[PDB]
Design an enzyme around this catalytic site. Structure first.
Site, short mmCIF file in Angstrom:
data_model
loop_
_atom_site.label_atom_id
_atom_site.label_comp_id
_atom_site.label_asym_id
_atom_site.label_seq_id
_atom_site.Cartn_x
_atom_site.Cartn_y
_atom_site.Cartn_z
N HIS A 134 0.82 -1.21 0.00
CA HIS A 134 0.00 0.00 0.00
C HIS A 134 0.87 1.28 0.00
O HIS A 134 0.37 2.37 -0.26
CB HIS A 134 -1.04 -0.03 1.14
N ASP A 173 -0.26 -7.61 1.38
CA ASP A 173 0.16 -6.21 1.41
C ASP A 173 1.70 -6.17 1.56
O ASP A 173 2.24 -5.44 2.39
CB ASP A 173 -0.51 -5.48 2.58
N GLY A 213 2.63 6.49 8.73
CA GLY A 213 3.96 6.49 8.15
C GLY A 213 4.89 5.44 8.73
O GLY A 213 6.08 5.45 8.40
N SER A 228 4.05 2.00 8.69
CA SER A 228 3.86 0.72 7.99
C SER A 228 5.19 0.32 7.33
O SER A 228 5.88 1.17 6.75
CB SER A 228 2.78 0.84 6.93
#
Ligand SMILES: COc1ccc2c(O[C@@H]3C[C@@H](C(=O)N[C@@H](CC(F)F)C(=O)NS(=O)(=O)C4CC4)N(C(=O)[C@@H](NC(=O)OC(C)(C)C)C(C)(C)C)C3)cc(-c3ccccc3)nc2c1
Ligand SMILES: [Cl-]
Ligand SMILES: [Zn+2]
EC number: 3.4.22.-
Length: 194
Positions: free
Chosen positions: A69, A93, A149, A151
């Site tokens: 993502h 992801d 911010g 991830s």
């Protein structure tokens, strides 16, 4: 198009994490266009950016992992030019770029500890109680902006081994109370898959 660019890094080395910025906005944009980044990779966690988002990437088992993502199918800028993803899994992801042979990388946790530590992009080291293979509860609720911010960053065990990659926060009315992460066993399944 445009490559993901390393803009900073987080050093864990001695008891307290610290974030170090290595590129400003202008240098980042230039590097994204060429895919050529002469800076050597250091630290346990990389702070990375696209033109619209900043997030983290963590090296485990010699692969630099991050979230789809954030990175999409983008290449990452490197000393040898843009590096194409080795692993891409939209459902998990997950994205991974193979790191150079012999580069520093985290090793997987096998101790079974439920005491985890999430490293944020601001180099905060937050305790997390493991709840299942891919979930952990925060010991203090946090405003969701605190985790934005982060991830792609690591969850570590008390021995400093990798438990997983931070993916999403369990958020209710702007309050994060738990975290969702990609377990290191799942990264290994991705690596072992032809
Ligand atoms: C399998 O489990 C999952 C789980 C989550 C996925 C995903 O989550 C999206 C992405 C993730 C997120 O926003 N991550 C943040 C950290 C968070 F604490 F804020 C981040 O740093 N990335 S970013 O987008 O801000 C960008 C780097 C700057 N989400 C969430 O954190 C959401 N929570 C959530 O979804 O919780 C569940 C899983 C418990 C339902 C909110 C926004 C409400 C806080 C929703 C996005 C995608 C995805 C994959 C490919 C392409 C597009 C989206 N896949 C996911 C798969
Ligand atoms: Cl361990
Ligand atoms: Zn461990």
């Amino acid at each position: 198009k445009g490559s993901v660019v390393i803009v900073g890094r987080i050093n864990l080395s001695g008891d307290t994490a610290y974030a170090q910025q290595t590129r400003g906005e202008e240098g980042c944009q230039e590097t994204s266009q060429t895919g050529r980044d002469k800076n050597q990779v250091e630290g346990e966690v990389q702070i990375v950016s696209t033109a619209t988002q900043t997030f983290l990437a963590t090296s485990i088992n010699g692969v630099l992992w991050t979230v789809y993502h954030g990175a999409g199918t983008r290449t990452i800028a490197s000393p040898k030019g843009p590096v194409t993803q080795m692993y891409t899994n939209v459902d998990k992801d997950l994205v991974g770029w193979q790191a150079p042979q012999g580069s520093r990388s985290l090793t997987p946790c096998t101790c079974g500890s439920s005491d985890l530590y999430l490293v944020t992009r601001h180099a905060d080291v937050i305790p997390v109680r493991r709840r299942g293979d891919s979930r952990g509860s925060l010991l203090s609720p946090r405003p969701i902006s605190y985790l934005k911010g982060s991830s792609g960053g690591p969850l570590l065990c008390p021995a400093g081994h990798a438990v997983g990659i931070f993916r999403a926060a369990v958020c209710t009315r702007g309050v994060a109370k738990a975290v969702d992460f990609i377990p290191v066993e799942s990264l290994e399944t991705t690596m072992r898959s032809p």
